[PDB]
Amino acid sequence: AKTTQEKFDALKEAGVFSGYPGTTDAKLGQDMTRAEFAKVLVKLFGLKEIHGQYSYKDKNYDAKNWAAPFIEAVTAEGLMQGKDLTKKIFDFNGKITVEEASKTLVTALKLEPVKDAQNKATDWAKGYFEAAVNAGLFSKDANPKANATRAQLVEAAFAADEMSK
Ligand SMILES: CO[C@@H]1O[C@@H]2CO[C@](C)(C(=O)O)O[C@H]2[C@H](O)[C@@H]1NC(C)=O
């Protein structure tokens, strides 16, 4: 029965998550940018970084932005598409929510969204969130609309990696 900290240690050693300078603090109560999560997903599923392509219009989404290869890589993979197709905003500094994370992971694992699912998640996300709860990636008592904590993301990422194999 591994702890969240032991799961983090494992994922860090595998380069999927990172820690923080000068400390052993994995900061498991803190949250994570959608940019950082994109990089998590790339490391977790072994995707190819995509350089010199920019599919979004956010301020400072350009070549000087370290996250673009990652965000592009998950966009090409179909795991993420940003918050508005018309204006092409990804929101890379915005924090990843439990239901957003649920979408990326169910899709990556090729699990089926639950049609007509009922739960506290935003309408677009109810099927993904329910599917993630069922697979054990988050607890049914998690707030789907909340920023996901690192801990929650470690546990989701660890479970996902195990299913993946
Ligand atoms: C506000 O609209 C939502 O934004 C979500 C943001 O995060 C992810 C995981 C993503 O694809 O980046 O999911 C997005 C939702 O699918 C949804 N976006 C749209 C265009 O409907």
Numbering used by the authors: 28 to 192
Quote the study on this structure.
Prokaryotic cell envelopes often include proteinaceous surface (S-) layers composed of self-assembling subunits in porous two-dimensional crystalline lattices. S-layer anchoring is best characterized for Gram-positive bacteria, where S-layer proteins non-covalently attach to the PG layer via species- and strain-specific non-classical secondary cell wall polymers (SCWPs). SpaA possesses three consecutive SLH domains near its N-terminus, followed by a large C-terminal region presumed to harbor the self-assembling domain(s). The crystal structures and binding analyses presented here of P. alvei SpaASLH, SpaASLH/G109A, and SpaASLH/G46A/G109A with synthetic SCWP fragments provide novel insights into the functional contributions of many conserved SLH domain residues, including SLH-Trp13, SLH-Gly29, and SLH-Arg43, which precisely interlock from three different SLH domains to generate two active binding sites.
To investigate the molecular details of SCWP binding by SLH domains, we synthesized the monosaccharide 4,6-Pyr-β-d-ManNAcOMe, which represents the pyruvylated moiety of P. alvei SCWP, and co-crystallized it with SpaASLH. The first co-crystal structure determined reveals ligand bound in G2 only, in a narrow pocket formed by conserved residues from all three SLH domains: Arg61 (corresponding to the conserved SLH-Arg43 of the TRAE motif) from SLH1; Met107, Gln108, Gly109 (corresponding to the conserved SLH-Gly29), Lys110, Glu127, and Lys130 from SLH2; and Trp151 (corresponding to the conserved SLH-Trp13) from SLH3. The pyruvate moiety of the ligand is bound deep in the pocket through salt bridge interactions to Arg61 and Lys130 and hydrogen bonds to Gln108 and Gly109 backbone amides, while the hydrophobic face of the ManNAc ring stacks against Trp151. To further investigate the activity of these two potential binding sites, we performed isothermal titration calorimetry (ITC) analysis of SpaASLH binding to 4,6-Pyr-β-d-ManNAcOMe in solution, which revealed 1:1 binding with an apparent dissociation constant (KD) of 29 nM. Upon binding in G2 of wt SpaASLH, the phi angle of Gly109 (SLH-Gly29) and the psi angle of Gln108 (SLH-28) each flip by ~180°. The backbone carbonyl of Gln108, which hydrogen bonds to Arg61 (the conserved SLH-Arg43) when unliganded, is resultantly replaced in space by the Gly109 backbone amide nitrogen, which forms a hydrogen bond to a pyruvyl carboxyl of ligand. Concurrently, the removal of the hydrogen bond between Gln108 and Arg61 allows Arg61 to make a bidentate interaction with a pyruvyl carboxyl and O6 of ligand. The backbone flip requires the flexibility of SLH-Gly29 in this location as the resulting phi–psi angles are disallowed for all other amino acids. Therefore, the near universal conservation of SLH-Gly29 suggests that this backbone flip is part of a conserved mechanism for SLH–SCWP binding.
